[PDB]
């Protein structure tokens, strides 16, 4: 059954980048809009738009720089089978800083740079490389 909708979202974006898809729709939630706002903020997607009233639908307009795709490798880190909670010192950098890692901290859903600057660790959701 669906047991990890975040990894489902990242799957939608990997398979949309891999199929030269212009835009990606999915069911929407607060955590997916938080992550999507981080992705737009860090420049991996072009835009997002949440529509619907009783059944919201998140839509990510994807990016393609050259013919190549911008989101090179998006991975889900803290899956439901095994959750991964890092401190502010253990908090990893991806592609030696060239690629953010979306961590859910108590202050909100941030990146690794932003939460290492904020001085607080948390639950590391996904590597975007």
């Amino acid at each position: 059954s669906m047991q990890d909708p975040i990894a489902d979202m990242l799957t939608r974006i990997r398979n949309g980048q891999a199929a030269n898809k212009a835009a990606v729709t999915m069911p929407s939630s607060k955590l997916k809009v938080a992550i999507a706002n981080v992705l737009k903020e860090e420049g991996f997607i072009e835009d997002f738009k949440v529509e619907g009233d009783t059944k919201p639908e998140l839509e990510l307009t994807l990016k393609y720089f050259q013919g190549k795709a911008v989101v090179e490798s998006i991975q889900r880190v803290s899956r439901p089978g095994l959750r991964i909670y890092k401190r502010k010192d253990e908090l990893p950098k991806v592609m030696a800083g060239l690629g953010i890692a979306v961590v859910s901290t108590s202050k909100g859903v941030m990146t690794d740079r932003a939460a290492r600057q904020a001085g607080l660790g948390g639950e590391i959701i996904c590597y975007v490389a």
Binding site: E42, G43, F44, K63, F65, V70, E72, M95, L98, G99
Partner: peptide, 13 residues
Amino acid sequence: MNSPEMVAAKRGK
């Protein structure tokens, strides 16, 4: 393997 002036080219800055 891509460089910091290529990743910053892709994602805006």
